[PDB]
Amino acid sequence: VQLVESGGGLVQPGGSRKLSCSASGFAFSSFGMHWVRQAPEKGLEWVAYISSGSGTIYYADTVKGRFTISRDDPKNTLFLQMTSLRSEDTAMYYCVRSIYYYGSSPFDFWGQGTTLTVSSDIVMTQATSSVPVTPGESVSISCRSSKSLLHSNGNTYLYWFLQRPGQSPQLLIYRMSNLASGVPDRFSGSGSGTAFTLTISRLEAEDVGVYYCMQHLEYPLTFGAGTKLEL
């Protein structure tokens, strides 16, 4: 499956720009889509949503009313239209794939990104900005919540992603304890409401990067700072 998106560059102040994403390899009309951004040195940050069926639309409080999301089902392409660009909005923007029914795995495929350049609610806080590591040793990461993420129906909507030096994020653990497909089975994570820990066994190579935690209990969706392993 592939998601290739384009439409990047640099603009003068004020201005405008449109972005697009092209899908091939799956049934595009049964999924719901997201846009997620990342500043050149900070963490990840969510942007907007649209459902499968085009019934629901959500927007981030920071730029709500000045962006727009839309799709085109018969030809499998996704759009985002944005205007009046400020000096802050310089980042990379991603397209993510998602589907919801009883038991599905959402956020399980990310794209390759695209670079743009310009010239209350729940809080989630990473423990430590960076940790020194050694091969072969068991290691553990942690972030924390403000409210409880656990619901009356019995779930806990906290997520974990990993980003290797020079690539796109990858899903590891969804709804706080479940391991995604195609992931080596040496990962695991658990915690108590408002306090969580991701744990790894037999630390390998190619497991350097920054580990992230996201909540999905109520909109907006919020991210943590990141926790980098050094090697």
Binding site: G53, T56, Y100, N153, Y219
Partner: peptide, 17 residues
């Protein structure tokens, strides 16, 4: 009013079916 964010997405796709 006691539905989560993920329960409403399931409700919509049932309606489409």
């Amino acid at each position: 009013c006691t539905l989560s964010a993920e329960d409403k997405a399931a409700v919509e796709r049932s309606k489409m079916i």
